Amino acid sequence: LRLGERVLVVGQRLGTIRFFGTTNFAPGYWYGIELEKPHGKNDGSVGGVQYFSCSPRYGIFAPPSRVQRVTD
Amino acid sequence: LRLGERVLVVGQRLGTIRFFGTTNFAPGYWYGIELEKPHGKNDGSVGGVQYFSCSPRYGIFAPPSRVQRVTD
């Protein structure tokens, strides 16, 4: 890992669960989460299909394997 | 994990290494990274102390354990 190298940084963002269920963008069950900061990718909808509703950029979707309670 | 519950979502952000070295904010060696999106926490400095320089919010710092090459 040298200077200039493109990388991926692993981290956690705090948010609130606003949805859990199947979706159109992918198989499986997904949590829809509203972050505290504009670090998200959507407003609760994906490709026009709504799942939950929040301000643009604060919305995000993640599989159970990437969601954990703060108290854990 | 019910609706309304506050949680932590684990994810990865893409970025470029712009620094590696010791710092004032904490012991150990830290990578300073400039993300592609305003999802960071600083402009390359922390508490007035500069390490690298980038636009506000695109800068972030992370320990070796949380940084990985894209090709991995």
Curated annotation (Swiss-Prot), chains A, B:
Residues 21-63 form the CAP-Gly domain. It comes from the Eukaryota. This is CAP-Gly domain-containing linker protein 4. The gene is CLIP4. The chain holds residues 485 to 556 of 705 of the full protein.
